[PDB]
Write a protein that binds this DNA or RNA. Structure first.
Lengths: 59, 99, 400, 77
RNA sequence: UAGUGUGAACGAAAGAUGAAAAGAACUCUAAAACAGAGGGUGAAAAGUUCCUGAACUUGCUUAGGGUUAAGGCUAUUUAUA
RNA sequence: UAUUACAGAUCCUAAUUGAAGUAGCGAUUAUCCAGGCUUGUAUCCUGGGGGCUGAUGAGGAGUAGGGUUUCUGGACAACUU
RNA sequence: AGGCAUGAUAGUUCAGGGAAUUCGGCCAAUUAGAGCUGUAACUUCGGGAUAAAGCUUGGCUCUGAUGAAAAUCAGAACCGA
RNA sequence: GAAGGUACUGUAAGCAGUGGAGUGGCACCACGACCUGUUGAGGUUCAGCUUCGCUUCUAGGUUUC
C-alpha cells in the first residue's frame, strides 16, 4: 500500500537521509509488514533495504 | 485481430519543430504514443524505460530520430509495446515488418 | 480647424468590407464591351501561380534616363495548362437583368467535371451525374436548344474547365493497355476541375454560335487567347493572414509608450454625438484573403513544354529551363506559362483567372519594346550561386 | 504600513488570566479590568447595569445561598 | 450559549414525525452504509430541523403568441382595428 | 376594544433570481516511463530517468506565540480553486 | 488535454539617422573589474579625483625574483575569427 | 527512405604525421594551445521546399427527402 513509515525508520537505523534508502520492488510485501525497528534491522542484514553509495562530486 | 511487430524510424525534429521549447521532450513521447496507436490501431500504448531514458538523455529542451520496435500483444484486448532498438546510423532504414 | 491638424484618411473606403472571400478562383465581375464585328475571340483564361523570378531587360525609351540601358525587373510566372470546353450558355436581356436561356452540353463529359457536383466522391457508389448518355433525349434536345439561342439570347458564354489529366497507378510501368487509369491531381492536390464561363466578344450572336460550337469539345491553349505585349488584368484572391490588430490592418500611428492598457490601438473610436460607432472607423478583424483585380499587367513571354529551350533567351546559345534549380511550395512547370511583369495577387498554388483589359492605354509603356537579355534560374533556398546544374560540375567537378 | 505588515510582531500578551475573575488581568498594571482585583471590593458601575448582572449573584452555583431562600418559602406559605 | 475584540464591553440563529417508533426486515442492480427499485409498517408516509407547505425561481407535460421590448383598456365572428 | 389594512422609506429580517456554465482556477523547479495497492491515481507508495533548492537553503534546531498540530491504526459527507 | 492569429505583460534584436519624440533624454542604451600611464579650473589647502583622457587583459610552453611556504608578481616565446 | 535535387553552417570525431615556442627523461620515448592529411567534411534540410519508390499503413458513426 504505502512504505512511508519504513523509509523514515530505515533512515534513522542506517544513519542516512530518506534520499539514500534503496528498497526493492520484488519484495514490497515483506517490507510493508515491518512496523518496528528490530523488524527493519533484519531486513537490512538480508540485503533487501540498502544504504546506497553517495552521488559523485570529483575534484 | 492480428499480433505483429514493426520496426520504424520516427522523425522527431519535425514532430517538435516550432513547438514550445521547454515542452519538447514531453511532446516527443506524446508523438510516439500517438504515432504508435495509429500504427497498430491500438487504444493503449506502453513505452519501455530504455526508450524513455533515450528521449530524455539530452535534457528537457530531444533526439532528432529514433528507431522503435512496436509490438501488438494481448492482455483479447491488444496492446502496443513500443521499445528501443539501438542502431549506429539511420541511412537506409525503411519501415519494415519482423518475423 | 477642429481636427487640430490635417492628415489624409487611414485606409481605403472603397474596398469594404475587409473580410474573407470563399471563392477558390478569381470571379470575374464584368467583361469588356464587345467591339461588334471582327471575330468572337475568347477573353478569359485560368492559370495557377507557380512562383517568381527576376529578369534583366534592356530598355528602349526615347527621352528618358534609361535609354539603351539594362533594367532588373521582378517577374511572376503563372503555369497555364490547356483547358477544355464543355458547355455553352445564352443570356437574354430583360428589365431585371441578364437572365439565362439554357445551357447546352457536349456529347460526353469527363469525370473531372462530375467531381464538382459532389462533396463526397469517395463515398458515392452510384456516382450518377450528367446522365445525358441516353441517346434519344440528348441528340434531339441539343438542336432544339441551339435553335432557341439564335432566337432570344444576345450574349453567349462558353463553359470550360481545367485539365487535371490522367496517369497510371504506382509501380505499374505506364504506357500499357491492361493497366487501370486514374486522375492525377494538380500541384495543389485537386482532381475536381475549376469550371468557369467565358464571354465571347464576337459580333452577330449567330456568328458566335459558329465559333463557340466549333470550339466545343476541344482544348484551348493560351497562344490563341493572349499574345506577347498584351496588357492583362489578373483576378484572384489574395494572401490570408487571419485576425489582425488596428495598427497593422489600417496602418495607423500607434500611441505613446506610456499608455495604460497598451498602445496597439486607435484611441478615439468617435465623438459623443452621434451616439454610435461609424462604419468609417478603423477596427480589429480579418486581414488578407480578399478578392481583388489588378490592371495593366504586361506579359513578357509565352511558354511551351524535351528541348527545354524555354528558359533561355535569344542570346548566350546555352539552353536553360524556366524552373529554378531545385524547383518552393510548387512544382516544375511542364506546361504553357506566362512571364507576367511584377506582382500577381495571391499565394503560390492559387488559381488566377486572367482577363483582357476593359479599356486601352495610350501611355507608351503599354506599347514598349520587350527584349529580354537574360533570366534568373537560381534556387530560392535561399542564396543561389549556380544558375544551372551544368555550371556545378564545371565549377566543382570533383567531390566525394 | 499601518495594516497587514504591522500586525506581524503581535506576539506579546497584554492581559493574562485573573485569579478572582478567572476571565484580562493587566500584567504591567497588575489589575483585573473586569473585576478590579486586587481591590478588596469587586468592580461594578451603575452605567453597566446590563454587564453587571452577568457576573452577579444568580449566575453561579449559589451553594450556601439557595438553601437560605428555601427556608423562607417554608416559614411563609 | 455559539461567536468577536489586547481590553472595558458586545451578543445571535434555532419550537411542531405519529395516538403509539409500529424509526422501514428481507431480496434485486451495484465495487459499495453511493443511489435507487421491489416488498412491508401505519387510519394516512406524515420517513427523521419529518403537521399545514403560500409566493419569487426552476423542471417535465399540454396549448397558443412572436419583424413592432412586453403589459393594459374598448370592440367583436380571437387575431386583428 | 385595539401593538387594526402597505408597493415604495439608499426601510428591517428571511429566502431567491438574471448576469452565468460566463469572469476565472493565480504565485511557487519540470516533469516522464514502468510496477505495487485499488471499482478508480499524473497526484498515494516503490524503482529508474530528467530537474530544482544550491549553507541567511521549503536543511537541522530554538525564544515569543500556538496548544496536541506530534505518533500508529482505520476513514473520505465536507475541506486542502 | 489541445491550439498559437490578435491583444496584455516580462524579455532579447533592430538598416540609415541620433532626442527631430516629449511639459521634461521619462525610459532604455553607452560606461564599468583590475594593472600601467595621466589628471584641470576652483579650494575652508583637507578636498576636487575613480576628475577627464589613453592603453593592456585570453590560451598554451617556459624563465626569473621574494618567502619556510604547496603562494603571488614580474618578464619572454608561440598560437587563432 | 533515396537523390552528382536544393539549402544553412564551415572542415565532425578518431587516427596518423622527419609538422610544432619548448620543458622533462632513457641510451629516441613522455607532455604540448595549435597546424597539415583523411575532409567543401560532419551535422541539419518540411515541420508550410521539390522530384520518384507498390518499403510500411489505412476504421467506423448519425440524421436529412
Amino acid at each position: 500500500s504505502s512504505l512511508k513509515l519504513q523509509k523514515r525508520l530505515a533512515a534513522s537505523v542506517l544513519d542516512c537521509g530518506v534520499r539514500r534508502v534503496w528498497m526493492d520492488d520484488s519484495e514490497v510485501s515483506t517490507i510493508a509488514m515491518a512496523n518496528s525497528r528490530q523488524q527493519i534491522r533484519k531486513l537490512i542484514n538480508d540485503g533487501i533495504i540498502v544504504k546506497r553509495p553517495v552521488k559523485v562530486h570529483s575534484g | 485481430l492480428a499480433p505483429a511487430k514493426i520496426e520504424t524510424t520516427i522523425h522527431l525534429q519535425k514532430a517538435v519543430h516550432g513547438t514550445t521549447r521547454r515542452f519538447r521532450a514531453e511532446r516527443a513521447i506524446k508523438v510516439i504514443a500517438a504515432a504508435a496507436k495509429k500504427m497498430m490501431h491500438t487504444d493503449v500504448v506502453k513505452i519501455d524505460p530504455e526508450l524513455n531514458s533515450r528521449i530524455w538523455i539530452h535534457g528537457k529542451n530531444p533526439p532528432t530520430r529514433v528507431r522503435v520496435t512496436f509490438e501488438r500483444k494481448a492482455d483479447e484486448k491488444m496492446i502496443t509495446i513500443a521499445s528501443f532498438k539501438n542502431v549506429a546510423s539511420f541511412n537506409g532504414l525503411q519501415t519494415t515488418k519482423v518475423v | 480647424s477642429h481636427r487640430k491638424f490635417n492628415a489624409p484618411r487611414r485606409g481605403s473606403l472603397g474596398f469594404l468590407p475587409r473580410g474573407r472571400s470563399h471563392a477558390v478562383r478569381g470571379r470575374v465581375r464584368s467583361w469588356p464591351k464587345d467591339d461588334a464585328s471582327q471575330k468572337p475571340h475568347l477573353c478569359a483564361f485560368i492559370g495557377y501561380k507557380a512562383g517568381m523570378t527576376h529578369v534583366l531587360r534592356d530598355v528602349v525609351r526615347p527621352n528618358s534616363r534609361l535609354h539603351k540601358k539594362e533594367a532588373c525587373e521582378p517577374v511572376t510566372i503563372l503555369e497555364t495548362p490547356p483547358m477544355f470546353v464543355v458547355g455553352i450558355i445564352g443570356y437574354k436581356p430583360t428589365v431585371e437583368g441578364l437572365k439565362p436561356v439554357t445551357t447546352v452540353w457536349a456529347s460526353y463529359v469527363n469525370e473531372e467535371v462530375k467531381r464538382n457536383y459532389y462533396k463526397n466522391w469517395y463515398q458515392s457508389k452510384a456516382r450518377k451525374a450528367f446522365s445525358c448518355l441516353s441517346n434519344g433525349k440528348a441528340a434531339e434536345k441539343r438542336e432544339k436548344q441551339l435553335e432557341e439561342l439564335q432566337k432570344e439570347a444576345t450574349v453567349i458564354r462558353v463553359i470550360a474547365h481545367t485539365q487535371s489529366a490522367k496517369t497510371t497507378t504506382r509501380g505499374v510501368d505506364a504506357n500499357e493497355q491492361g493497366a487501370k487509369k486514374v486522375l492525377k491531381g494538380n500541384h495543389l492536390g485537386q482532381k475536381k476541375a475549376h469550371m468557369i464561363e467565358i464571354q465571347i466578344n464576337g459580333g452577330d450572336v449567330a456568328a458566335k454560335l459558329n465559333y463557340a460550337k466549333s470550339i466545343l469539345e476541344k482544348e484551348i491553349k493560351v497562344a490563341d487567347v493572349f499574345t506577347e505585349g498584351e496588357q492583362i488584368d489578373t483576378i484572384g484572391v489574395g494572401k490570408g493572414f487571419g485576425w489582425e490588430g488596428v495598427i497593422h490592418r489600417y496602418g495607423t500611428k500607434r500611441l505613446q509608450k506610456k499608455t495604460h492598457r497598451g498602445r496597439r490601438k486607435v484611441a478615439c473610436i468617435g465623438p459623443w454625438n452621434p451616439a454610435r460607432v461609424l462604419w468609417s472607423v478603423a477596427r480589429y478583424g480579418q486581414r488578407g484573403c480578399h478578392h481583388r483585380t489588378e490592371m495593366n499587367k504586361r506579359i513578357y513571354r509565352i511558354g511551351a513544354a524535351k528541348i527545354n529551350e524555354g528558359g533561355s533567351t535569344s542570346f548566350d546559345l546555352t539552353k536553360k529551363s524556366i524552373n529554378p534549380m531545385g524547383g518552393p511550395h510548387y512544382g516544375l512547370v511542364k506546361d504553357d506559362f506566362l512571364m507576367i511583369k511584377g506582382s500577381v495577387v495571391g499565394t503560390v498554388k492559387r488559381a488566377i483567372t486572367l482577363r483582357k483589359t476593359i479599356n486601352i492605354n495610350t501611355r507608351r509603356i503599354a506599347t514598349e519594346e520587350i527584349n529580354l537579355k537574360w533570366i534568373d534560374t537560381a534556387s530560392k533556398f535561399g542564396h543561389g550561386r549556380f544558375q544551372t546544374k551544368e555550371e556545378r560540375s564545371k565549377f566543382l567537378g570533383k567531390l566525394k | 504600513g499601518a495594516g497587514t505588515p504591522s500586525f506581524g510582531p503581535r506576539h506579546n500578551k497584554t492581559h493574562t488570566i485573573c485569579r478572582r475573575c478567572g476571565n484580562c488581568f493587566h500584567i504591567q498594571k497588575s489589575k483585573c479590568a473586569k473585576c478590579g482585583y486586587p481591590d478588596a471590593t469587586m468592580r461594578h458601575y451603575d452605567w453597566e447595569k446590563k454587564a453587571h448582572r452577568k457576573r452577579a449573584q444568580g449566575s453561579g452555583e449559589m451553594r450556601h445561598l439557595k438553601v437560605t431562600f428555601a427556608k423562607l418559602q417554608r416559614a411563609y406559605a
